[model samples]
Target chain A: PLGSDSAKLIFINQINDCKDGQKLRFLGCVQSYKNGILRLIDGSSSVTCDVTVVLPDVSIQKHEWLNIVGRKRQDGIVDVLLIRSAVGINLPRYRQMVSERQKCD
Target chain B: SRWNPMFISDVHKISFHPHYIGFWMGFPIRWIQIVGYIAAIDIYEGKHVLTVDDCSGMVLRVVFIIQDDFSMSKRAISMSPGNVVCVFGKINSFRSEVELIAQSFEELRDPNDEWKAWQKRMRYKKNLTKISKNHH
Candidate 1:
């Protein structure tokens, strides 16, 4: 039997293009994390996240970065599955990757 | 060198041929290279396993042979997160996804030198497009 499919990694700009209920992972700068809610910016677009998975001793601060694993909801928000610090991500390199993907068919 | 460098999208676009490696962008570029961030590395007794995310929205694994030289083994062990390297290898598919066997490793020396790598890749593509009319 086949198992559940893994979430697809994407840039925030690709969010709207995906159909609702799309499972995705993306990197973004943390805007804020409070009350089980999250706000992040990927330079191209911003997204609001609802943190569903809970973990202890994880300190997520503002202006830091997170690589999020989440699924898009019909209401235009993401329901997060995992949230981890994404330090050392090269922004220019990441954006270049996005540009190449966009430029190709 | 048959290490034809191409973006991961081109890698994904390749289709299998029964007797050939694969055809990428209308060419059989079996041997290829990619510059990418070393997302994660797992060191075993002899072999080192790695996952490379070239930022084209795919994080494919790079398989490699264990080193025999002591200093080179030290270099691989010394590798840390976010390190960028040019992975030269051959491409094949396993379970309908791409797999790369890294045959060579070249470091940036300066992490900020990505500009040169990117420019060179673009220049290579531009030249290929002109000469082979590869991309339509």
Candidate 2:
């Protein structure tokens, strides 16, 4: 059970350490932790990154997807390269998987 | 009641808003890159960042900057059972998500245990690999 005040949240941020500009590509999914279980699902591959940074955050339209940004540090410049997205699969297959795998072992 | 005691892994994805400020045509957004599993503020600088167990498990360690200080508190409480929180901010990609920046944050909680955390992360990775394999 959740506390009286608990809602699902998606967090995204980037990391960089560079002085010059950089570009990156983003592709990933969202995972939810609930009921003593963590749930992961496929998300948008349609996201993209054009700048290199130390640490950055991804943009989501509405309150829909969960996304994260990644980068590499080089010579004081961080090269942004990957974009990860997160969302509830909310699918029957995934739900079943969660139920079975999460069972007490 | 929140069960999952595992913190967010660096391998998970985070989400934010689209049409907000800090969405520069080009820039870098910096996020925290953690090594092992860090669920909540167990003892950040010796200060407990969270209070409730549910809050502790559900909250994520996402690094974002406060761009605006509206009276509305600039934060959203939990919306649904599965939904942990609804944070509003100008999220742009910097490295992974993109060249993005975080203006604010909203907190939420998950209900699970540590074993469940491992299972979920593994499944997530498995699915990811499946997608990647199909591409090749």
Candidate 3:
């Protein structure tokens, strides 16, 4: 089924393009965790607004990837509702591409 | 050695570890790969670009640019967030940024199943390690 309109992927750079209160989904590497906020980065844009999750015990660590789904708050931060680890998925072909680039360099 | 692509855990690691031949001390021994979950998709003028993330816990931008002749199915275009994807492409870096010129892109169906299995194994392995450590 087609996910809700808010389920679309919104790159960090594109966050400003979204309407306030719109739901958004994106992925990023965990930069840090403190208090109730999680800092994440999408690698190519400005740092993400602080992500606040209800579960303080969310089993996440620095450098791990997360698939986040949440609603955009009026203050520009995201109110995260769901976060999942993305460590297990493998990308063999992209790996090949990187290796090739290194070899040529 | 011929160029052979390999999987990379994080995209941000690429800058710290660039290409260096021989047993150079500064060379990174790890392989880099372009893989991540679809965060966003954009198509313009018949060219396709996808923003993806593997949660490498660093600030980095990785994109996959699909080829014109690419065989990605139509269903792939409608892919939503959280959809896992893998791509084979050539690495292109310009002005300190990195992107992949994709030769092919494949969407993996039902990735959560694999993730669940991996989590189970990881928990089991952690338990075994704990037991072993306690015994010692």
Q: Top lDDT: which candidate number?
A: 1
Pairs with backbone N, CA or C atoms under 3 Å apart (clashes), candidate 1: none
Candidate 3 Cα outliers beyond 4 Å, as residue runs: A1-68, A71-105, B1-9, B15-32, B58-67, B73-76, B112-136
Task: Give the least accurate 10-residue stretch of model 3 chain B, judged by summed lDDT.
Answer: B20-29
**Over 4 Å off in model 2, which ranges?**
A1-105, B1-7, B10-59, B68-73, B76-83, B86-127
Docking level for model 3: incorrect
lDDT tens per residue, model 1, A32-60: 87787788887768888888464426677
Instruction: Flag the better candidate by TM-score, 1 or 2.
Output: 1
Q: Considering lDDT, which of the candidate structures 1 and 3 is the better prediction for this target?
A: 1
Please give, for residues B44-131, the per-residue lDDT of candidate 3 as tens digits: 5556666665433222233433355645634446676566676665555554655565666667655354333323333443554476
Question: Against the true structure, whose TM-score is highest?
Answer: 1
Best by DockQ: 1
Error of 3 at A79 (Å): 3.5
Measured by C-alpha RMSD in angstroms, how accurate is candidate 3? 15.0
Expressed as tens digits, the lDDT of each residue in A69-88 for candidate 2 is 22323332223332233344
- Fnat for each model: 0.00, 0.07, 0.02
Candidate 1 residue lDDT tens string, B1-136: 4678766655777788655388755566788888765667777777676666555555666666576445544565577645667777888676577777777777654534544565566767767766667455
